[PDB]
Amino acid sequence: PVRRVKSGIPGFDELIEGGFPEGTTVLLTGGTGTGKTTFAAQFIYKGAEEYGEPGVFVTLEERARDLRREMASFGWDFEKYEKEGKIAIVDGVSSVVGLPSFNVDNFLRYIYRVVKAINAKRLVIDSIPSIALRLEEERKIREVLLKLNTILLEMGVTTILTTEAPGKLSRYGIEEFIARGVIVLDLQEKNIELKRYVLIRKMRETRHSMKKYPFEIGPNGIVVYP
Amino acid sequence: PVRRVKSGIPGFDELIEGGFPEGTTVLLTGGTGTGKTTFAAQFIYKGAEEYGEPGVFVTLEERARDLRREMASFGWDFEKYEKEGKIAIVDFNVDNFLRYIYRVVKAINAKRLVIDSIPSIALRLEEERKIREVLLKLNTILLEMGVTTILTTEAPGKLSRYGIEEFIARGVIVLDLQEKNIELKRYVLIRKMRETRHSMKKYPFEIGPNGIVVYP
Amino acid sequence: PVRRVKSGIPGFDELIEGGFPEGTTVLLTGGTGTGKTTFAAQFIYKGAEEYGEPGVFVTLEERARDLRREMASFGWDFEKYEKEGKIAIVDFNVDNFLRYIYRVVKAINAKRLVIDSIPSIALRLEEERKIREVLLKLNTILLEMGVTTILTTEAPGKLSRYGIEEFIARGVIVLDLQEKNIELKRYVLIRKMRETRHSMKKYPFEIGPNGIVVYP
Amino acid sequence: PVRRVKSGIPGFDELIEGGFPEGTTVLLTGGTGTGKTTFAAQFIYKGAEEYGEPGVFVTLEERARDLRREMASFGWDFEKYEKEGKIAIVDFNVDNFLRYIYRVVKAINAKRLVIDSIPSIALRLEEERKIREVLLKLNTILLEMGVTTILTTEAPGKLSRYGIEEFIARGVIVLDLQEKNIELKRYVLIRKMRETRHSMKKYPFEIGPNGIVVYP
Amino acid sequence: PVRRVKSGIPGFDELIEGGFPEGTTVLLTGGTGTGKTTFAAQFIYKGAEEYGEPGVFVTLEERARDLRREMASFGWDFEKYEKEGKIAIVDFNVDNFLRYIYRVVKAINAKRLVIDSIPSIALRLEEERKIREVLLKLNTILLEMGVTTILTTEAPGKLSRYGIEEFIARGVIVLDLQEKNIELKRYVLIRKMRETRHSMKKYPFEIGPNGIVVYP
Amino acid sequence: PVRRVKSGIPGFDELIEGGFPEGTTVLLTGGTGTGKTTFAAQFIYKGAEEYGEPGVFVTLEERARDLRREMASFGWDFEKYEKEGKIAIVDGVSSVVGLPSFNVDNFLRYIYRVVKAINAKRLVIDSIPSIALRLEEERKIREVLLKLNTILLEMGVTTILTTEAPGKLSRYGIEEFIARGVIVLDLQEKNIELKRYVLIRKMRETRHSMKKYPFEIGPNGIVVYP
Numbered sequence A, F: 001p002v003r004r005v006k007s008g009i010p011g012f013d014e015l016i017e018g019g020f021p022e023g024t025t026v027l028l029t030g031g032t033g034t035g036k037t038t039f040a041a042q043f044i045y046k047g048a049e050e051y052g053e054p055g056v057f058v059t060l061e062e063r064a065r066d067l068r069r070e071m072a073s074f075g076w077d078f079e080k081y082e083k084e085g086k087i088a089i090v091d092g093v094s095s096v097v098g099l100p101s102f103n104v105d106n107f108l109r110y111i112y113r114v115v116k117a118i119n120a121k122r123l124v125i126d127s128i129p130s131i132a133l134r135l136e137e138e139r140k141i142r143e144v145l146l147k148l149n150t151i152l153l154e155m156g157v158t159t160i161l162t163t164e165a166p167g168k169l170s171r172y173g174i175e176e177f178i179a180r181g182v183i184v185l186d187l188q189e190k191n192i193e194l195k196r197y198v199l200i201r202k203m204r205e206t207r208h209s210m211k212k213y214p215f216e217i218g219p220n221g222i223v224v225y226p
Numbered sequence B, C, D, E: 001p002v003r004r005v006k007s008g009i010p011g012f013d014e015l016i017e018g019g020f021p022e023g024t025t026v027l028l029t030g031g032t033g034t035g036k037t038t039f040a041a042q043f044i045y046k047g048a049e050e051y052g053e054p055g056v057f058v059t060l061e062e063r064a065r066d067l068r069r070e071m072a073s074f075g076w077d078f079e080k081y082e083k084e085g086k087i088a089i090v091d092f093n094v095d096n097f098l099r100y101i102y103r104v105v106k107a108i109n110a111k112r113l114v115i116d117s118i119p120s121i122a123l124r125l126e127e128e129r130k131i132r133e134v135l136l137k138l139n140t141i142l143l144e145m146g147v148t149t150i151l152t153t154e155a156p157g158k159l160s161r162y163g164i165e166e167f168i169a170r171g172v173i174v175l176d177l178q179e180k181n182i183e184l185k186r187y188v189l190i191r192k193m194r195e196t197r198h199s200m201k202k203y204p205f206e207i208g209p210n211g212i213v214v215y216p
């Protein structure tokens, strides 16, 4: 009887039999501006606020203060849950408060330390391209992804990793090999208007819907519709 | 008079005159989430449970505890058959990897073998394109062992990820997801199948509570 | 309340809840001749004339006299506002480039910045693909300056020339030329804008005697 | 009068004015599972049985026992004709490979030759792209032997895998699988044949219990 | 108040408000045989004959005697105007090539310049991709000289052969051949044109006994 | 008043105002088996037989004896004109008879010598890919093409060069830069049948037809139709 992590996104859990199987790494993929960051933030924020599960949002796309400001526009008070120790933001430039002190191995050690310090049940790495673009050699993302996979398996948290391609499921062709779930966010062209769609392409241990579902990014975040 | 190895997948054997010809290496290809790991698990697991044939499931995609756990969602108790010595799950050194599968296959007298997946091997090499040399080395031991094997590979067009996998298989099975009208629907096709007048049609299938079923 | 920077482009602000969130880096992308330089130049120029906001226009695609003469054809007198200290035109050493932009921005207390263009920077490097490392250095100084910036890039498919520009922007505007049936017509689309419920539709626009006008 | 070598494929000779001009090197190309090995094997086998003409089948895609067992499923008894000296099966050092083919061909006075396949040679090289230099060395020995040869290559677009194979052939046969509407159906087309006014149309064919049959 | 340089091509000036803005570098792009060399010749040759403006035609595509000979097929006597010192034809050392065009342009007080073609330069480099560095060097002297220049490039989609040429031009003219129904018909389009509200329509043209004519 | 070289191909000269301008290099391009070799051979053979102009056929695609045998199937007796000195075939393995003794510079010297020895007015190089595939480095075809161009200009003969692509006009993207004429041979798909078409894409000094023309390879070679 699989334990399920509620996504935090109204309309979504019903597509995946109540939520993500505990312990799954989910690849959230889509083009620029399809809602990846938002959807990942909602997962962590709602995890903490509605379901009381601590979460770590790792970002190399922006700084922590950018994410707090941006998510405030949905009414989400990240800093409130940070002071309560239910959320940490790892950007790192700024060390998480209370957890002081591109280098891949330090990075991964530090995410592991922070997951363990708050007893995180939820984790986001936004994004894989943000990591890759910071390496000496962008194609070593291959070796970095295999190191990440090893620490995800050890930590056993429920994780969203984001990646970005416009055919291709992912940017590098590798990201999907370390994920047991895949969610696509898209903007379809019809006919002078782009509407947002989500599709669950893959989800382990789950008889998930295989249909495209409309969605909106509203004043209170993502809502998925019939 | 070719001896046939039953797939374990309802609706599938009838497409290939009763089964896989014994000793064949079969390439199982399809995009992410098209049912490859499930198909290969079903072939090993029903081999043991229903046909009493020992089998080896080699996974570099995940670990044995993940595979056991995921497969119980379909009613399949992999550990029961591991302790009876009817299934082994094998969880980068290429030559040792190969030696070890060889030894486990002999050790349990396997008749079925799965390697899930070729990309998973290749992504662990120092240079990913050395999968070419690795595949030729793997072809050589498959030929020695003479078991019935499913290798999995994954491409989005192109039949395989590297354009090489198909040169060491004598059968190819494609799993797919099609567009219709705002739903994704699953299909299987036998592209090639030595010694067999197999169907060339596309068939719908479902992945349900008892795993894969192929329809008319 | 998010504080917004008015574009200077008639018909455009209502597409983005009144203007660009202050401090945003916006990528403006489009093929040759889709109107990127004019859009950028209008943002800086109307910022100075219409709203009093000082602005820096960095160009490696042309010299400062070229841009002055060219924008005069729209009735825009750049030199007037340069003399009043409300516009600076900045006309290969990457670190010195970046330091200089930061200086000029500070010196006039700039609220607006344009860099025209990312490709024009890349093409002057020892190795073109080092734009990746250059774009990362730009990002850190944009985040430090906290001004409102337009960066242009050019491709006609792909969003950007290099596949990297979009990762340092929190807004994306696409300018396009569509064929219908004998004639190319200009369209703008807002692909991304942080903190903004923007329109997602394609709008027609034209470049006329007073620069860009976006239509319903 | 051009002397022609009868294919052994029912329905095919009439497409090429009765057969292959003697001494021609013919490239047979097609995707995985389009029937290239069967076509080649039928050319050698029916050459021996039907016309008395001795033939060499070189394969790096499988072992000799594999091809014997596989072709038995068509009622073809390769070993009978091997024992009578009318068929040789030749089952990485390029020069030694080539020398050996030339020897076996001379030893049985072969009129027919197959090499299955060009990719299977390329994939065994130290560097795959050295097939260019290998194909040039093959060409010179085919021209010396003056037998009638089929070379296979595989791509599904491009005519050949490497873009080079076609330059050492004076005939080209394409085997294909076309979708209609639920089913893959097999077609053959003669793209090129020297000294021959061949048909230029696509013909259906099937692989049945007696091998290939081409239809109107 | 922008000064305009008449094209010399009937039907074309009216598409660009009377002519090219003085000092502009114009990229003229199109596939093989779309009329580029003819268009550029016509611009230099009518410049001299009809408008009394000196011009330089730089060709690395062919030699001066070929160009004179080909152009007389259109009634154009290039040598007459070479001896009056109103046209020069310039027939690998990059820096010397550049120095030399500079000197010939000064030497005859040229107002018009053609370089036919960018690919022709690039194909003569030690490394063809150094055309990037060469183009930036050429941009620097075009900016110094301030003449009105047509550069030609050739791509089959992509606007240019290298994706770089368009970053040193402030106008782009596309010449094309379209499919209709079993004939190829010629068209011209102005993609971009600084300082000009130019037509965005596609226009048919003919290359006749008097060279290029543009139609409605 | 341009001097014109009659192509030798019935139905063709009318497309190019009576023939090729004397001295032109023409790129003959098309996919495998579209008639390139045949069309080039007809030009040389008919040049010699019908119009009395000596011709050199250079081939690295096949040997001279292969070409004589192959062209005999059209009724063309190459060896007859070879003994009369009106045609030479350069393959080279075999030196042209009477002109004794991969190396690029030797190659080009030898074609120049043979053109000059028979006072050739016609030249064929079948094919550019055949040269390129024999080089140490296939991409040096670029440098080889510029050397070829220099000797073509010096010799002033009327030349066909053949190249082979299936979008792309040529195999390498370079061949068209040394040619002042381009002819495409194609096979169009309609509807289970491939029919042959020729199109003149470019021809210097000529108001050539711009239409696709059907053609056949018949028992007496190419014939082009209305």
Ligand SMILES: Nc1ncnc2c1ncn2[C@@H]1O[C@H](COP(=O)(O)OP(=O)(O)O)[C@@H](O)[C@H]1O
Pocket (backbone or CB within 6 Å): A030, A031, A032, A033, A034, A035, A036, A037, A038, A039, A073, A074, A217, A218, A219, C191, C192, C193, C194, C195, C196, C197, C198
């Ligand atoms: N508060 C808001 N209200 C409504 N929509 C918003 C709001 N903030 C941002 N958006 C929308 O969400 C988008 C940002 O999505 P984002 O999650 O950053 O995409 P990605 O990470 O895929 O590039 C904006 O481009 C905008 O369309």
Ligand SMILES: Nc1ncnc2c1ncn2[C@@H]1O[C@H](COP(=O)(O)OP(=O)(O)O)[C@@H](O)[C@H]1O
Pocket (backbone or CB within 6 Å): A201, A202, A203, A204, A205, A206, A207, A208, B030, B031, B032, B033, B034, B035, B036, B037, B038, B039, B073, B074, B207, B208, B209
């Ligand atoms: N227990 C379940 N019940 C129904 N469907 C399931 C169940 N578990 C997994 N699936 C389906 O099977 C898919 C997993 O298939 P999988 O064999 O891993 O594909 P692949 O290896 O090609 O990526 C999931 O995406 C889901 O759709």
Ligand SMILES: Nc1ncnc2c1ncn2[C@@H]1O[C@H](COP(=O)(O)OP(=O)(O)O)[C@@H](O)[C@H]1O
Pocket (backbone or CB within 6 Å): C030, C031, C032, C033, C034, C035, C036, C037, C038, C039, C073, C074, C207, C208, C209, E191, E192, E193, E194, E195, E196, E197, E198
């Ligand atoms: N003064 C003008 N009046 C009307 N249209 C103009 C004027 N100047 C330029 N244009 C039009 O605007 C275009 C300029 O586009 P530009 O901003 O330079 O595009 P980009 O930077 O994307 O290449 C010209 O191609 C022309 O079509």
Ligand SMILES: Nc1ncnc2c1ncn2[C@@H]1O[C@H](COP(=O)(O)OP(=O)(O)O)[C@@H](O)[C@H]1O
Pocket (backbone or CB within 6 Å): B191, B192, B193, B194, B195, B196, B197, B198, D030, D031, D032, D033, D034, D035, D036, D037, D038, D039, D073, D074, D207, D208, D209
């Ligand atoms: N005994 C048989 N009877 C009928 N069909 C067969 C038989 N054996 C093989 N086939 C069919 O012929 C195919 C063999 O094709 P093959 O010659 O090996 O193709 P290729 O070399 O191009 O990959 C099999 O995929 C199958 O469809």
Ligand SMILES: Nc1ncnc2c1ncn2[C@@H]1O[C@H](COP(=O)(O)OP(=O)(O)O)[C@@H](O)[C@H]1O
Pocket (backbone or CB within 6 Å): E030, E031, E032, E033, E034, E035, E036, E037, E038, E039, E073, E074, E207, E208, E209, F201, F202, F203, F204, F205, F206, F207, F208
């Ligand atoms: N004197 C002529 N009369 C009519 N058309 C001609 C004449 N000379 C050349 N042409 C046409 O012009 C074409 C040459 O155009 P050109 O300017 O060289 O194109 P490009 O440089 O783009 O390859 C020839 O292909 C032919 O169609």
Ligand SMILES: Nc1ncnc2c1ncn2[C@@H]1O[C@H](COP(=O)(O)OP(=O)(O)O)[C@@H](O)[C@H]1O
Pocket (backbone or CB within 6 Å): D191, D192, D193, D194, D195, D196, D197, D198, F030, F031, F032, F033, F034, F035, F036, F037, F038, F039, F073, F074, F217, F218, F219
């Ligand atoms: N004597 C013949 N009679 C009729 N057609 C022939 C004859 N000889 C060859 N052909 C046709 O001509 C073709 C050969 O064309 P070829 O000039 O070698 O093409 P390419 O050099 O473009 O590959 C053959 O493929 C065949 O269709």
Ligand SMILES: [Mg+2]
Pocket (backbone or CB within 6 Å): A036, A037, A038, A061, A126
């Ligand atoms: Mg994001």
Ligand SMILES: [Mg+2]
Pocket (backbone or CB within 6 Å): B036, B037, B038, B061, B116
């Ligand atoms: Mg799998």
Ligand SMILES: [Mg+2]
Pocket (backbone or CB within 6 Å): C036, C037, C038, C061
């Ligand atoms: Mg611009």
Ligand SMILES: [Mg+2]
Pocket (backbone or CB within 6 Å): D036, D037, D038, D061
């Ligand atoms: Mg085969």
Ligand SMILES: [Mg+2]
Pocket (backbone or CB within 6 Å): E036, E037, E038, E061, E116
């Ligand atoms: Mg030209």
Ligand SMILES: [Mg+2]
Pocket (backbone or CB within 6 Å): F036, F037, F038, F061, F126
């Ligand atoms: Mg040929």
